[PDB]
Amino acid sequence: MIYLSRLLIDTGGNPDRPRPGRKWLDNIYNVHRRLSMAFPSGLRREQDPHFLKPFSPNDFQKTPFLFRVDNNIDGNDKRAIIIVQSVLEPDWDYCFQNALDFLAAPPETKEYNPEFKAGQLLRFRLRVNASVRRHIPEMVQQDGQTIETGKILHKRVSLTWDASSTPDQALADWLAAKSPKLGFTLQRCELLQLGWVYGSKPEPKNVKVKEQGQGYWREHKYNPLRFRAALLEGVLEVDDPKLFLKTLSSGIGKAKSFGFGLLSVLPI
Amino acid sequence: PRFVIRRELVVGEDVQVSRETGTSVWRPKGTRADYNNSEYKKVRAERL
């Protein structure tokens, strides 16, 4: 019981007119917020029928979901798609009823109920996060001297593959290291895109307190976010089919709310 | 009856012209406009 939805984002076509779709896709945090906005529980749907209200994050269901933004070529054109997998029914009607300029085509919701056993060859294509935690973290490197401010800063930083090692093989063995826990096997994994994605979160702070109440003289700070990204496809061999359903319903990665994690599997 | 005489005075030499009090014809308030103002610059931050 997995809803495999699909979006057809309306990008630009003239870099002299406003193109809100590309600007929206430029920031991953706004993409995540807009995708999460499609889940009104019982209050935002019935009280306001036109989404003309101030935004309240507590008014939306905290339903876990995965999404990957990518591109495809069907028969005569190139389309930017956002494949979204979720366990609750997505309310795309409530999401773009005011911002229909964002979307080029009406969305789709097709049920995905796979009954997959082991030992059958299947093909896949997923985008994954490529961060590791260094048990020996390098110091702060204060740029005036580039030695140290503190000593230890345990940080998710980057997956580094030696000096002359190939990146695709390194990513393949890194995935195959955790593959027995998940329950598949790789033979011809390949790397297509390897880069970074960027975002910015508000994360409000406080500066001054009111003359008669709480610290409502507060303003908005801004915390940037960076993510190392890999996109990889190939074929996987199914083992222990109980676990593969959990991996399909959960996703492989550490940034499942920022694109990485969704795995799309097709039969041979 | 009573005998009454009539003389004259010259204004400025004899009587100094006083100045009117602070007053004007009533006009509806046309308000003001100022964004540089720091209080609005922080009110907008609270709203955002």
Side-chain angles (χ1 to χ4, degrees):
Chain A
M1 203 257 310
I2 285 307
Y3 298 111
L4 199 63
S5 46
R6 182 175 70 256
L7 257 45
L8 271 191
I9 315 291
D10 192 7
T11 47
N14 199 328
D16 206 50
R17 315 300 207 247
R19 309 160 318 154
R22 178 165 254 138
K23 253 196 75 64
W24 172 61
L25 282 198
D26 230 2
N27 185 14
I28 187 56
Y29 185 59
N30 305 140
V31 174
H32 171 258
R33 194 194 257 163
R34 183 127 275 284
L35 263 306
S36 267
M37 224 168 273
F39 296 138
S41 38
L43 267 187
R44 218 76 183 278
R45 180 123 49 105
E46 212 77 88
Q47 290 172 312
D48 41 297
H50 294 317
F51 208 4
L52 301 173
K53 292 296 165 58
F55 181 71
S56 149
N58 328 308
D59 218 335
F60 294 78
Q61 322 197 228
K62 196 50 79 199
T63 319
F65 66 102
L66 323 157
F67 70 102
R68 179 214 333 161
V69 53
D70 218 54
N71 315 119
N72 64 349
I73 292 113
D74 318 333
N76 214 48
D77 36 358
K78 162 158 65 158
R79 328 194 149 274
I81 57 182
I82 302 199
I83 326 188
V84 185
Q85 148 164 343
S86 64
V87 86
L88 253 59
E89 156 93 351
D91 205 303
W92 306 125
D93 305 271
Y94 200 77
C95 205
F96 313 114
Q97 82 173 140
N98 263 19
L100 214 56
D101 215 313
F102 279 46
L103 257 283
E108 161 79 295
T109 326
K110 172 243 178 206
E111 186 42 62
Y112 190 53
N113 256 299
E115 301 315 329
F116 284 180
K117 36 170 160 193
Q120 40 153 3
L121 245 186
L122 305 179
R123 86 162 307 113
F124 73 108
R125 178 197 216 233
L126 85 169
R127 169 106 42 108
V128 81
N129 184 26
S131 197
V132 313
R133 195 102 61 172
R134 296 321 283 278
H135 207 318
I136 165 65
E138 283 310 281
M139 318 64 64
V140 198
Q141 316 312 117
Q142 29 170 24
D143 198 24
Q145 293 69 29
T146 70
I147 194 43
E148 55 187 20
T149 315
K151 316 298 160 288
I152 305 303
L153 315 96
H154 288 273
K155 225 151 53 173
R156 256 195 211 125
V157 277
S158 279
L159 182 133
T160 284
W161 57 104
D162 210 282
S164 63
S165 54
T166 89
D168 37 356
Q169 205 273 345
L171 261 305
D173 61 61
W174 179 72
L175 211 69
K178 46 201 77 193
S179 77
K181 323 156 68 59
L182 313 149
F184 44 82
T185 325
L186 321 180
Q187 59 123 344
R188 51 160 57 182
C189 156
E190 62 221 89
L191 201 53
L192 293 191
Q193 256 173 217
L194 183 75
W196 293 74
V197 315
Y198 303 83
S200 297
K201 251 208 94 190
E203 263 155 74
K205 287 309 193 103
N206 215 334
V207 51
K208 171 63 161 37
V209 298
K210 278 271 185 162
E211 65 274 67
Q212 67 105 69
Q214 88 283 17
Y216 193 35
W217 301 134
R218 62 213 178 132
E219 70 106 28
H220 260 307
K221 272 310 165 206
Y222 260 112
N223 190 45
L225 330 171
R226 340 198 217 281
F227 296 91
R228 189 73 164 137
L231 168 60
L232 67 170
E233 68 193 44
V235 281
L236 61 77
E237 301 88 72
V238 193
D239 283 330
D240 41 274
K242 134 85 180 148
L243 292 312
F244 196 82
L245 256 57
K246 168 165 182 48
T247 74
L248 216 30
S249 81
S250 51
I252 307 108
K254 302 263 157 305
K256 322 183 178 263
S257 96
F258 289 96
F260 327 104
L262 157 71
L263 176 79
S264 35
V265 194
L266 264 202
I268 171 185
Chain B
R2 48 161 213 144
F3 281 109
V4 186
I5 48 193
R6 294 161 141 81
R7 340 285 279 171
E8 276 125 32
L9 311 169
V10 190
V11 46
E13 162 264 344
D14 183 81
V15 177
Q16 333 303 320
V17 164
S18 161
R19 296 327 293 169
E20 55 260 61
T21 66
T23 173
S24 87
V25 284
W26 180 88
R27 294 281 320 250
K29 170 60 73 151
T31 71
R32 264 291 276 139
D34 177 21
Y35 304 104
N36 113 90
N37 161 267
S38 81
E39 297 87 299
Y40 174 99
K41 216 186 315 170
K42 155 201 67 162
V43 158
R44 66 167 261 152
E46 308 155 53
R47 194 63 222 204
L48 296 165

